[PDB]
Design a protein around this ligand. Structure first.
Ligand SMILES: [Zn+2]
Ligand SMILES: [Zn+2]
Ligand SMILES: [Zn+2]
Lengths: 32, 113, 39, 45, 263, 42, 67
């Protein structure tokens, strides 16, 4: 299970005291 | 190739005095002190200690070039007092302040540990 | 080849990051294009 | 008199300024001089 | 008159508040702790064999940056002030590293815990490389594969960060005063409203925000200074603070001695 | 079907660079030369 | 080539945290969370570990020149 399996109302209870397309996760081998 | 040795910033040559005092005859009771192998750390401390003395009418310093480790201080005092005595009083006062600061820090560290 | 432990760990990290990027960036792009379309 | 090292099998040997420049065991044509014995010092800066 | 208040205390970092001192005194203390507190660091490297993929000066530079224990470095002497021939036990510490990979497969990591102290001052706590725990391996120095060996002999000497940054006991000293900008020492850039475009300081709750009807006080001076001192492990934070104070006192006493001797 | 995102375009570009590489024109021209051009010139 | 011993900007020792960083990334932590776990707060120190490329692993694949 994960955050997705959580109920939406309980997800609403997780309030910081969305991903953006231009912040990639770093790699080491790349591709090509 | 032309880079100076790094220890020249703080090691005093045998023929170079640590301190050279000359009078400034333009205004009365003023001297020019040249400090060798020193920088802003001592200069700013001495200047802002001396600036609070009632009998000190002028105090300033300048580092002429950052590639040379020296600064020059100008000090002017009242008629009664001599500038060298004011400089000695400033040094003693800062030493006393640092002593009590160290004592209180050690006390608080022992309390909190 | 007899690969080192650090290199194998980095390969696993790279596979996980590639999968996560392929999911998240595509989802964010879909959300952005639908929002730009509905305006 | 002078040590060498083969460029392929990393074998050590010596030459007397009269042998052909070759590896003894694998016959490679590329050999390298060995590091000196003088003291080597660095200033760690 | 000067006061000290400690907020958080640790072996490697202390967060304190200085009050009733001049700004110049606090800044000079910061500068002294950054650049003028003596420590111990490797300065000469004798390389007896190095068959790794790293250049000799590369490894020497990495060795210079390893923090060593410098607790008793005040009792040691400067190498140029020691009358001894070559290096002795009163002005240097000798460390030795010997690493090799056994087997025809895999890779061996060379850590700073492999440095062994061979000689140094008698009964002084100086020379050993710093380690966070007993099971910590330390700083990664090199990597070796089969038939590659590293065999070096290092000499640790006393120095200050003015000569080279490897002798600095501190990493970064946070420094801050007047979180609410009552002295108007900075003029805040803004687009619409300066108040809501600038994040609040972490010490903003330690001082009372100015009243809306208050007028500018031109007689005020900076009085309270917040600073955090982080150390690399070569010295403890309280040791760094005390030795910075002592170094400043010694510099002032030297100035006073030169003045009195000038007559 | 479903729409084509920018990530799909980058997947296609990755396929291109996986097949061709960056110096494919040089190698292909030299291979054509060695394979047929010498015989035709003779 | 190999992880620097000290941070370039401030001089914090970052050379003892490379293997722990790789371990944390293996366990599935995000890079920012892994850097937070290693107590790298200033972004100058985070840059040192986040942007390092380990080239020594490629250099070690060539056979040793002396045996
Ligand atoms: Zn051979
Ligand atoms: Zn000696
Ligand atoms: Zn840093």
């Amino acid at each position: 299970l994960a955050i997705e399996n959580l109920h939406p109302d309980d997800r609403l209870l997780l309030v910081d005291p969305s991903p953006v397309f231009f912040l990639r996760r770093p790699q080491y081998v790349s591709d090509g | 190739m032309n880079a100076p040795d790094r220890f020249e910033l703080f090691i005093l040559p045998d023929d170079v005095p640590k301190l050279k005092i000359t009078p400034d005859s333009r205004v009365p009771n003023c001297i020019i002190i040249k400090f060798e192998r020193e920088d802003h750390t001592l200069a700013n401390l001495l200047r802002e200690e001396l600036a609070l003395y009632p009998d000190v009418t002028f105090v300033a310093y300048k580092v002429e070039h950052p590639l040379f480790a020296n600064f020059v201080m100008r000090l002017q005092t009242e008629e009664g007092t001599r500038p060298k005595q004011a400089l000695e009083r400033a040094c003693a006062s800062i030493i006393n302040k640092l002593k009590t600061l160290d004592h209180k820090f050690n006390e608080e560290w022992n309390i909190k540990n | 080849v007899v690969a080192s432990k650090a290199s194998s760990s980095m390969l696993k990290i790279d596979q996980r990051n590639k999968k996560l990027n392929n999911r998240f960036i595509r989802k964010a792009e879909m959300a952005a294009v639908e929002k730009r379309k509905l305006r | 008199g002078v040590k060498y090292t083969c460029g392929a099998c990393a074998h050590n040997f010596s030459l007397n300024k009269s042998d052909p420049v070759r590896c003894k065991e694998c016959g490679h044509r590329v050999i390298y001089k060995a590091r000196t014995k003088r003291m080597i010092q660095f200033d760690a800066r | 008159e000067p006061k000290v208040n400690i907020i958080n205390a640790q072996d490697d970092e202390v967060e304190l508040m200085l009050s009733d001192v001049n700004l110049s005194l606090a800044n000079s203390l910061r500068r002294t702790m950054l650049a003028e507190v003596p420590t111990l660091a490797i300065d000469l490297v004798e390389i007896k064999m190095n068959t790794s993929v790293l250049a000799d000066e590369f490894i020497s530079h990495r060795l210079g940056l390893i923090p060593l224990v410098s607790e008793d470095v005040e009792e040691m002497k400067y190498s140029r002030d020691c009358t001894c021939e070559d290096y002795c036990d009163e002005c240097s510490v000798v460390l030795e590293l010997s690493a090799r990979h056994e087997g025809e497969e895999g890779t061996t990591d060379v850590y700073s815990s492999s440095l062994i102290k061979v000689s140094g001052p008698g009964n002084l706590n100086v020379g050993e490389p710093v380690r966070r725990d007993d099971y910590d391996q330390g700083i990664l120095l090199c990597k070796l594969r089969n038939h590659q060996e590293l065999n070096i002999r290092c000499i640790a000497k006393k120095g200050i960060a003015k000569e080279h940054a490897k002798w600095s006991p501190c990493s970064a000293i946070a420094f801050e005063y007047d979180p609410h900008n009552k002295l108007k020492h900075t003029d805040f850039w803004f687009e619409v409203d300066a108040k809501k475009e600038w994040p609040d300081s972490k010490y903003a709750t330690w001082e009372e925000p100015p009243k809306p009807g208050e007028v500018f006080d031109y007689k005020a001076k900076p009085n309270r200074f917040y600073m955090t001192v982080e150390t690399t492990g070569s010295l403890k934070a309280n040791q760094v603070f005390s030795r910075g104070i002592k170094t400043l006192q010694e510099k002032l006493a030297n100035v006073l001695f030169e003045l009195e001797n000038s007559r | 079907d479903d729409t084509i995102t920018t990530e799909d375009c980058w997947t296609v570009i990755s396929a291109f660079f996986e097949e061709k590489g960056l110096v494919s024109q040089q190698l292909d021209s030299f291979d054509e030369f060695m394979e047929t051009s010498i015989q035709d010139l003779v | 080539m190999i992880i620097p011993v000290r941070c370039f900007s401030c001089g914090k020792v970052v050379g003892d945290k490379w293997d722990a960083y790789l371990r944390l990334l293996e366990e599935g932590k995000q890079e920012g969370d892994a850097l937070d776990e290693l107590k790298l707060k200033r972004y100058c120190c985070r840059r040192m570990v986040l942007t390092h490329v380990d080239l020594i692993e490629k250099f070690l694949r060539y056979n040793p020149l002396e045996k």
